[PDB]
Structure formats: structure tokens, C-alpha cells
A paper describes a structure:
To improve the quality of the density of the lipids near the pathway, we carried out symmetry expansion and additional rounds of 3D classification, which yielded one class with an additional four resolved lipids, for a total of 32 resolved lipids, 16 in each monomer. The observed lipids define the nearly continuous interfaces of the scramblase with the inner and outer membrane leaflets near the dimer interface (lipids D1-D9) and illustrate how the poses adopted by individual lipids result in the profound remodeling of the membrane induced by [name] near the lipid pathway (lipids P1-P7). The [name]/[name]+ structure reveals how the scramblase reorients the lipids that approach the open scrambling pathway. The downward slope of the OL starts at D5, a well-defined PG lipid, and progresses towards the open groove as P1 and P2 adopt distorted poses with their headgroups becoming increasingly tilted. The IL bends upwards and P5-P7 become increasingly tilted as their heads climb around the intracellular portions of TM3 and TM4, coordinated by the hydrophilic side chains of T341, K345 and T334. At the pathway, P3 is sandwiched between TM4 and TM6 near the constriction formed by T325 and Y432 and its headgroup points towards the extracellular side, such that it is contiguous to other OL lipids. Notably, P3 and P4 are oriented with their heads facing the outside of the groove. The distance between the phosphate atoms of the heads of P3 and P4 in the OL and IL is <22 Å, showing that the hydrocarbon core of the membrane is thinned by ~50% at the open pathway. One unexpected feature of our structure is that the extracellular vestibule of the groove does not directly interact with the membrane and no lipids could be resolved there, as they cross the open groove at the T325 and Y432 constriction. The wide intracellular vestibule is embedded in the nanodisc membrane and, at the open pathway, the P3 and P4 lipids have opposite orientations, suggesting scrambling might occur in the groove region comprised between them.
Residue numbers in the entry: 12 to 463, 487 to 660
The structure:
């Protein structure tokens, strides 16, 4: 059905001249041939060729699979001795696709073709992608669209098709959804019986966050042992953009390495603090200014055309936060390049960590402003917001803009409504923008280009369609789930139905993300992983911060949703600070206890890998060494 194709290499010739294009193309085909791959060339687009790649021989494929397993075993990623090369069948499609992707991409000295798409020698090579297995995808979709949980076999199927990175994301999402049943039930019970800002709800929520994060750390270790990816960072793919200072030739492996001093990278990484403060200043200024405009227009201004003026600050936020975030991403990418980052995974993790500052600010600063600035203050702030009358000025006359004043009277519903927005309406709108609109845009751009050799015209047209799809990044889905967890950990006392909303959304999220991968994206090459990465630390940080924000909220809103109704008088600053101190330190103590208790419970795959290391050394001692 896929015509035995392993990868499609898109070669762009449009932006270069014919002689250089022919020379580069011959070099590409020669490298593919010399690394043991069989090529077939077809017209991809009007400006690109498709190089269809396949293992030239079953013997060569078995040899490459055996060498990959041997490298994994030598670097300690697996403990079982690699089976001989005559029995070296790829145990899944993910393994064959990974071996062939390495053959295509790892440098010539490392034993492959050095095709680095969108790099120096290969800027014409635009994309290297495998083909979706449409029947398997549709079977999986229809099968687990009718179940509650995905089986371990279902997760293994995802890993065997898309690799362990996508597999880890779906395993984490399934575990998060399963753990969300407890806070969903408990928060519905509290919303029914206690209402919001309940001490018991906040305590149970912090305890649940602790338990889920520690359980997932343990489960990640177990799953990386079960998928044979534990310690996979030892064989992390180098990135071709790495600028070494000196070239050293280690004696263990007869190769030059290209060393770069770690302390120099740390000096360059000192610039992350100024970047973080820049992003905080810019994004917080935009967000707080738009919040002040929103407050003025919606609650201080009392002139004509109030809806058409209250839609102003939401528009300005929706236009300016994406733009400022794109600028900050450009700055973060330039800083990530300045830091040298030998490996692609280190580069990706560092960029994700820089972007997490922007994510935190843009996701949580609105609710933080409403909760800890608008509610306690803003009876002392709205006198300073008369200056924002000019935002309404190009619509209303100067006198009508001035005589539009009212008793402020803080809206005791503002905070609950903002939390309900971010945890329900944002979820629905994000589902729409994430699955529906890209799908419709793809179908529209297809029928636009489709409206205005005979035996492979269908396969070739569907390959040309797959070539237009988006490049899936599992980091985006992990980011979304971690930001959602942050909402739960930080602001769930305001509205205890947040975990119910997240439970429903995450059941739908598993299926809709799998659909997006299979239908709206090119099939990702089966990248490996032994963890969700920096997102685990992000979740730990968010739960820590939530122990502070939730206790502050429970203190401030003890008397109800109004709490300090605009005045900071009722808030005793020592009692708020003492609440925060004891809550955060009870949190840290309970987290230490839970982590230490879970460290005493070794999971089965972890214990099996330890015993297997022992058994491998015993086999070595029994065969050689007498
Ligand atoms: C103590 C909790 C230890 C965590 C282990 C655990 O609870 O099992 C999971 C169930 O998750 C859950 O129901 C979530 C329950 C929340 C546990 C912690 C609540 C904080 C009190 C999955 O286990 P299963 O494979 O059987 O599905
Ligand atoms: C939910 C039931 C969904 C279902 O189909 O049953 C099995 C799930 O059971 C399950 O594993 C259960 C999944 C984990 C159970 C977590 C439920 C915690 C509910 C705590 C509420 C207390 C709140 C009390 C507040 C006053 C599925 O079969 P499997 O074998 O595929 O799973
Ligand atoms: C809190 C920190 C926030 C404040 C400022 C941002 C960080 C300052 C450092 C900026 C990074 C600039 C930097 O590292 O320069 C490199 C050389 O530096 C170096 O070997 C030595 C300079 C390092 C200076 C770091 C100490 C400044 C702060 C601690 C005192 C360039 O490499 P090369 O030489 O090839 O040109
Ligand atoms: C991110 C996507 C932004 C693009 C459009 C976002 C759509 C949006 O803001 O929702 C509207 C109401 O918003 C609001 O209550 C605006 C409140 C603040 C939200 C501002 C953006 C975050 C629709 O209202 P609904 O029909 O859902 O009721
Ligand atoms: C308040 C903070 C505002 C800016 C935030 C940091 C943004 C960092 C900008 C990224 C950066 O460092 O630029 C590099 C220059 O390296 C540098 O010699 C600048 C280091 C500054 C030393 C202090 C480019 O790399 P190269 O020079 O190789 O071309
Ligand atoms: C981002 C902005 C976060 C906002 C934080 C503080 C603003 C308050 C600054 C101090 C202004 C104090 C002005 C003042 O005179 O008020 C006095 C009492 O204050 C008072 O009861 C002090 C009450 C201030 C209420 C603020 C409680 C915040 C609790 C923890 C939130 C951290 C969330 C961070 C998550 C990342 C007496 O009259
Ligand atoms: C779809 C594209 C646009 C999204 C429309 C916005 C969705 C919407 O307004 O529904 C929410 C409530 O829904 C819900 O509780 C249930 C909606 C479930 C949607 C699935 C229906 C099948 C709003 O809630 P509230 O009234 O606070 O405003
Ligand atoms: C895809 C993502 C799906 C998102 C999940 C959708 C729904 C579950 C979350 C509940 C949605 C409720 C949104 C509308 C809502 O807040 O209604 C509340 C009352 O009715 C409800 O309590 C609804 C019952 C729960 C307000 O009145 P309150 O409770 O504040 O007093
Ligand atoms: C978490 C941080 C947010 C909470 C800490 C915010 C500090 C709140 C504060 O200033 O203390 C209150 C006002 O000061 C006073 O009455 C007398 C002191 C007035 C001096 C001005 C306060 C500077 C606060 C700025 C400090 C850095 C921020 C006293 O409150 P109370 O007496 O009711 O007890
Ligand atoms: C309940 C009250 C709640 C608040 C009350 C007081 C707060 C006092 C501040 C405490 C400051 C310490 C905060 C804390 O929780 O420490 C835990 C570690 O425990 C530890 O090392 C274990 C050392 C235990 C110290 C022996 C107890 C002191 C004797 C006193 C006994 C009286 C009863 C955190 O673990 P974690 O994972 O972050 O590792 C970090 C690692 O790098 C530091 O060794
Ligand atoms: C140990 C962990 C907590 C110890 C208790 C905190 C000790 C310090 C208490 C400080 C003094 C105190 O008792 O607080 C009273 C009320 O507090 C309150 O409603 C409630 C205080 C907040 C309770 C703490 C929230 C729970 C945080 C969950 C963390 C668990 C993490 C680890 C667990 C797994 C004051 O009344 P007040 O008239 O001035 O109010 C005015 C206000 O309502 C303005 O609207
Ligand atoms: C809440 C339960 C808190 C109990 C202390 C949490 C705990 O179990 O720590 C153990 C020993 O560490 C300790 O320093 C024991 C200190 C015990 C004293 C804590 C009780 C009151 C203080 C495990 O430590 P290890 O990593 O060796 O396994
Ligand atoms: Ca979504
Ligand atoms: Ca998603």
C-alpha cells in the first residue's frame, strides 16, 4: 500500500539554478546509494523532486539493524546482548524506520549519509519523512474511540508505529487522564457540598498533584526500561550546526569528537536570566496594560457602545501576545544557537526551557492579575485608570468619554469567570483551532490546487498530499497538557469543577491528538525518548507554585467569592505570609515523604533490567574469563 517506501526525501530545486541543482542531486543519490539504500525519483511538486528511499537489500537492512542494536548495547541503552546479524529483523516498523533515518542522516564518518535537511551542504533537501500506514491508523482510531482507557498493548502499538517520543506523550496523557478521575470526583463533590475556596479541596488537590508527579516519574523509569530506551541520551543524535573549538580523537572509539568547553557554554547560558526578565517585562506589560484597559472599559466607563468597546482589549491581547511571543521565540532561538549544544535533544530541551517562561507568563498572568491585584487592590487603582479614557476616545466624543463614570463595585464574578474561561472555553476553542481549522485549511488548500505513471498516479498524488501536511512536534502537545496541569495546580480552588473539565477534555485529547498526528501531519520519524523531558520539571515547579497560590487564595477568599472586595484592609499580611509559609513547607515535606516512599518500590521492568545487567555480566564471566 505504501509501495515498500521507507522515506521520501523532498529535494527543492526552485530557488537554485539547473547545473547546481543537478550536481547536488547527483551527490544526494550517490550518498544514498553508498549507504546501502535504493532510490526512485519522481516529481514531487512543481519545484521539487521526490526521492523515494528503501533498504536496497534485506541483508543490508539486517546488518544495519544489528549495528544499531550493537551501538545501543555498547552504550548501555540495552542490557541483553544483541542477537546475531542473521536474526536481525526489525522488531517493529518504528525500528526499521529509525535505522533507515539514521542511515540517511548521521554523518559520513558515523557510518551514514550526511544528509542534513536545511543545512549547509543540504539546503535543497527540504524534508525527510516516512509514509503513514492509513489502514493501521484508521483501525486504531475506530478502536480506541470506543473505549475508556487505552491498553498497554494500544500504547505499545503507538510506540511501535511512531516511536518512543510520541509513545511517551500518549502514555503520559493516559496516566494523567486516569489520575484525573480522583480530582474530578473529589472536586465535583466539593463543588456540590462545600463550594469554592475549600481548605479540604486545596489540601487534597496539592496531595494529588504530588502523588501524580511522583508516580509519573516512577512510571517513566519503568516505561523506558520496558521500551529499551533507558539511558538513550548516551546515543543522542548530534546536530550538524554544532561548532566545535578543537577536534580530539578519543582512544575508546577511533574517531574525532569535536570538543567544546562546558564552562564556556555556561557563561553563554548566563544570558538566559536577561532573556527571562525581558520576556517577563514585555509580556507582562502587554498583559497588564490590556487588563487595565479591560477593567476601565468594562467597569469604570459608562458611556455608549459598551460591547464594541469591551471587545477592544481582548482583540489587542489576541493580536499582541502572539506577535510578542514570536519575537521572543526569535530571540530565544538566537540565544539557543549562541549556546552551542552538541546534540539535537539538548538544543530542543534548552529551547523548550526558554519558551516555558513565555508559556507560564501568557498562560497564568491574567488569572494572577485578577486574583492578587484586582481583588485586593483596584479600589485604590481605578482612580489611576482615568488616563485610559483615550482608548474609548476615537469612538465617542470627548464629553461622552468623560461623563461615563460609575461606582466601581468590584465584580465578585470576575475571577471565577476567568478561571471558567481558561479551563473550559479555552479548552473547547483550542480543540477547534488545533484539530478542526488545520484540517479544513488543508482540505481547502488541496481542492484549490487540485481544481485550479498511470498505475502509480494515486500513490504519487497521496504522497504529494502527505508532503503538504504539518510537521508534528510532540513538544506542543506536552506543553498544552503541562499548562493545563498548571491551571489545575494553581487555580482549582476558585472553581472545583476544573478537574472534571480536564478529565473530559483529556479523554477527547488522546483521540483528537492521535487523529491530528495520523491525518493532519506528516508521519514523524520514530524518534526515541526515555522521558517527556523538561516537562516533568515544569510539572514539579507548577505544583510547587500551586501550593503557594492555592493557599493564598484559600486565605484571601475565606469569607466567600468576594474576599477582600477591592480593599486590602481585610487581608492581614502576616497571616497571608504565614499561611503561605506553612502550606509550602507542608507541601515540600509531604512531597519528600511521597518521593522517598515511591523510591522503595522498584517497578518490574526496572528490576528486570538490573537483573539482566547482572545476568549479562554472568554470561560474559562464564564464557570468557572462565
Ligand atoms: C496512593 C496512590 C498511588 C498511585 C498508584 C495508583 O493510584 O494507581 C493508578 C490509579 O490512579 C488513580 O486512580 C488516581 C488516584 C489518585 C491517587 C492519589 C490521590 C491523593 C489522595 C493506576 O493504577 P491502574 O493501572 O490500576 O489503573
Ligand atoms: C471508570 C470505569 C471505566 C471502565 O470501563 O472500567 C474499567 C476502568 O477501571 C479502572 O481501571 C479504574 C481506573 C482508575 C480508577 C480511578 C478512579 C478514582 C475515583 C475516586 C473517586 C473518589 C472521590 C470521592 C470524593 C468524595 C476499564 O477497564 P480497564 O482494565 O481497561 O481499566
Ligand atoms: C545574572 C546574570 C545576568 C546578567 C548578565 C547576563 C549574563 C552575562 C554574561 C553574558 C554572556 C556573554 C559571554 O559569555 O561572552 C562569552 C565570553 O565570556 C567569557 O568567557 C568570560 C565572561 C563571562 C562573564 C560572566 C560574568 C558576568 C556575571 C557574573 C559576574 C563570549 O565568548 P567569546 O570569548 O568567544 O567572545
Ligand atoms: C486562543 C484563541 C484566540 C482566538 C479567538 C478566541 C475566542 C474567544 O476569546 O472566545 C470568545 C469569548 O472570549 C472571551 O470571553 C474573552 C475573555 C478573555 C479571553 C481573551 C483571550 C485569551 C467567544 O465566546 P464563546 O462563544 O466561547 O462564549
Ligand atoms: C536585557 C537582555 C536583552 C537581551 C537578552 C539576551 C539575548 C541574547 C542574544 C543572542 C546572542 O547572544 O547573540 C550572539 C552574540 O553573542 C555575543 O557576543 C553577545 C554576548 C554578550 C556578552 C555580555 C550571536 O552569536 P554570534 O556573535 O556568534 O553571531
Ligand atoms: C504578578 C503580581 C503579583 C501581585 C503580588 C503582590 C502585589 C502586592 C504588592 C504590595 C502592595 C501593598 C499595598 C498596601 O499598602 O496594602 C497593605 C496590605 O497589603 C496586603 O495586604 C498584601 C496583600 C496582597 C495580596 C497578594 C497575595 C499574593 C499571594 C501569593 C501570590 C503569588 C502568585 C505568584 C505565582 C507565580 C496595607 O494596605
Ligand atoms: C465549537 C467552536 C466554538 C466554541 C463555542 C463556545 C462553547 C461554549 O460557549 O460552550 C461553553 C459551555 O459548554 C458546555 O458546558 C458543554 C459544551 C460541550 C460541547 C460538545 C457538545 C456535544 C461555554 O460555557 P459558558 O456558558 O460559561 O459560556
Ligand atoms: C473538550 C473540553 C470539554 C470541557 C469540559 C466540559 C464540561 C465539564 C466542565 C463543566 C462545564 C461548566 C461550564 C458552564 C458552567 O460553569 O456552569 C456552572 C453550573 O453548571 C455546572 O456546574 C455544570 C455541572 C458540572 C456555573 O455555575 P456554578 O457551578 O459556578 O455555581
Ligand atoms: C507574597 C508577597 C506579597 C505579600 C507581601 C506584600 C507586602 C504587604 C505590606 O506592605 O504590608 C502591609 C502594609 O505595610 C504596612 O502596613 C506598614 C509598612 C508600609 C511600608 C510600605 C509597604 C512596602 C511593601 C512592599 C514590599 C516589597 C513588595 C501590612 O499589612 P498588615 O499590617 O495588615 O499585616
Ligand atoms: C509541618 C510544618 C511545615 C512547616 C514547618 C517548618 C518549616 C521549616 C523549614 C524547613 C526547611 C527544609 C524544607 C524541606 O522540606 O526539606 C526537605 C528535605 O528534608 C530533609 O532533608 C530530611 C532532613 C530531616 C531533618 C530532621 C528533622 C529536624 C528535627 C526537628 C524534628 C521536630 C519534629 C525537602 O526535601 P527535598 O526533596 O526538596 O530535598 C532537598 C535537599 O536538597 C535538601 O536536603
Ligand atoms: C500547615 C499548613 C497550614 C497551616 C495553617 C496556616 C497557619 C497560619 C494561619 C494564619 C492565621 C489564620 O488562622 O488564618 C485565618 C483564616 O485562614 C483561613 O481561612 C485558611 C488558611 C489557609 C489554609 C491553608 C490552605 C491549605 C493549603 C494546602 C497545602 C497542602 C500542601 C501539602 C498537603 C498535601 C485568619 O482569618 P482572617 O479573618 O484573618 O481571614 C481574613 C480573610 O478572609 C480576608 O478575606
Ligand atoms: C509526612 C511524613 C514525613 C516523614 C519523613 C519523610 C521520610 O520518610 O524520610 C525518610 C527518612 O528521612 C528522614 O530524614 C527521617 C526524619 C524523620 C523525622 C521526620 C518526622 C518529624 C520531623 C526516608 O528517607 P530515605 O531517603 O533514606 O528513604
Ligand atoms: Ca486540545
Ligand atoms: Ca494537543
Amino acid at each position: 500500500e505504501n509501495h515498500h517506501v521507507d522515506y521520501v526525501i523532498r529535494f527543492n530545486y526552485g530557488d537554485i539554478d539547473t547545473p547546481e541543482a543537478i550536481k547536488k542531486f547527483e551527490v544526494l543519490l550517490l550518498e544514498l546509494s553508498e549507504v546501502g539504500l535504493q532510490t526512485e525519483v519522481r516529481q514531487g511538486d512543481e519545484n521539487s523532486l521526490f526521492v523515494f528511499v528503501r533498504a536496497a537489500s534485506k541483508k543490508k537492512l539486517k546488518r544495519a539493524v544489528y549495528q544499531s542494536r550493537v551501538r545501543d548495547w555498547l552504550y548501555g541503552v540495552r542490557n541483553t546482548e544483541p542477537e546475531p546479524a542473521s536474526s536481525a529483523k526489525p522488531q517493529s516498523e518504528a525500528e526499521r524506520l529509525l535505522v533507515i533515518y539514521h542511515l540517511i542522516t548521521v554523518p559520513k564518518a558515523e557510518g551514514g549519509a550526511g544528509i542534513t535537511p536545511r543545512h549547509g551542504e543540504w539546503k535543497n533537501v527540504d524534508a525527510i519523512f516516512p509514509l503513514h500506514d492509513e489502514e493501521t491508523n484508521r483501525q486504531c482510531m475506530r478502536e480506541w474511540s470506543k473505549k475508556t482507557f487505552l491498553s498497554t498493548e494500544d500504547l505499545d502499538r503507538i510506540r511501535n508505529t511512531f516511536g518512543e517520543h510520541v509513545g511517551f506523550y500518549f502514555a503520559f496523557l493516559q496516566s494523567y487522564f486516569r489520575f484525573l478521575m480522583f480530582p474530578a470526583a473529589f472536586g465535583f463533590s466539593c463543588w456540590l457540598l462545600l463550594g469554592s475556596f475549600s481548605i479540604i479541596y486545596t489540601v487534597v488537590n496539592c496531595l494529588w498533584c504530588i502523588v501524580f508527579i511522583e508516580y509519573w516519574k516512577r512510571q517513566e523509569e519503568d516505561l523506558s526500561c520496558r521500551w529499551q530506551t533507558k539511558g538513550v541520551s548516551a546515543v543522542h543524535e548530534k546536530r550538524a550546526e554544532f561548532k566545535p573549538e578543537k577536534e580530539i580523537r578519543d582512544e575508546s572509539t577511533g574517531e574525532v569528537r569535536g570538543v567544546f568547553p562546558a564552562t564556556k557554554r555556561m557563561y553563554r547560558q548566563l544570558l538566559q536570566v536577561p532573556f527571562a526578565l525581558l520576556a517577563a517585562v514585555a509580556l507582562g506589560a502587554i498583559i497588564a496594560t490590556c487588563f487595565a484597559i479591560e477593567i476601565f472599559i468594562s467597569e469604570v466607563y459608562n458611556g455608549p457602545l459598551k460591547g464594541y468597546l469591551v471587545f477592544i482589549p481582548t482583540i489587542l491581547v489576541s493580536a499582541l501576545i502572539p506577535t510578542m511571543s514570536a519575537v521572543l521565540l526569535t530571540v530565544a532561538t538566537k540565544l539557543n544557537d549562541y549556546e552551542n549544544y552538541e546534540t539535537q535533544d539538548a538544543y530542543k530541551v534548552a529551547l523548550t526551557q526558554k519558551i516555558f517562561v513565555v508559556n507560564f507568563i501568557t498562560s497564568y498572568l491574567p488569572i494572577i492579575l485578577t486574583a492578587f491585584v484586582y481583588v485586593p487592590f483596584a479600589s485604590r487603582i481605578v482612580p489611576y485608570l482615568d488616563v485610559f479614557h483615550l482608548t474609548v476616545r476615537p469612538f465617542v466624543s470627548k464629553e461622552h468619554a468623560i461623563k461615563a463614570r460609575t461606582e466601581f463595585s468590584i465584580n465578585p464574578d470576575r475571577l471565577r469567570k476567568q478561571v471558567i474561561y481558561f479551563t473550559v472555553t479555552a479548552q473547547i476553542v483550542g480543540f477547534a483551532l488545533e484539530t478542526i481549522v488545520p484540517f479544513v485549511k488543508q482540505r481547502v488548500f488541496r481542492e484549490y490546487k487540485e481544481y485550479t505513471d498511470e498505475d502509480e498516479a494515486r500513490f504519487l498524488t497521496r504522497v504529494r498530499n502527505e508532503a503538504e501536511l504539518e510537521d508534528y512536534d510532540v513538544t506542543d502537545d506536552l506543553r498544552e497538557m503541562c499548562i493545563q496541569f498548571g491551571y489545575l495546580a494553581l487555580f482549582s480552588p476558585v472553581w472545583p469543577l476544573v478537574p472534571v473539565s480536564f478529565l473530559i477534555n483529556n479523554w477527547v485529547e488522546l483521540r483528537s491528538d492521535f487523529f491530528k498526528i495520523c491525518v493532519e501531519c506528516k508521519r514523524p520519524w520514530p524518534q526515541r525518548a526515555d522521558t517527556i523531558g523538561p516537562w516533568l520539571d515544569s510539572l514539579g515547579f507548577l505544583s510547587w507554585v500551586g501550593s503557594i497560590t492555592s493557599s493564598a487564595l484559600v486565605y484571601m477568599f475565606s469569607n466567600g467569592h468576594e474576599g477582600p472586595n477591592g480593599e486590602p484592609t481585610t487581608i492581614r499580611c502576616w497571616a497571608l505570609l504565614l499561611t503561605i509559609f506553612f502550606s509550602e513547607h507542608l507541601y515540600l515535606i509531604v512531597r519528600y515523604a511521597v518521593r522517598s516512599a515511591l523510591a522503595k518500590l522498584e517497578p518490574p521492568n526496572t528490576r528486570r533490567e538490573r537483573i539482566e545487567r547482572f545476568m549479562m555480566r554472568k554470561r560474559y564471566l562464564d564464557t570468557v574469563l572462565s
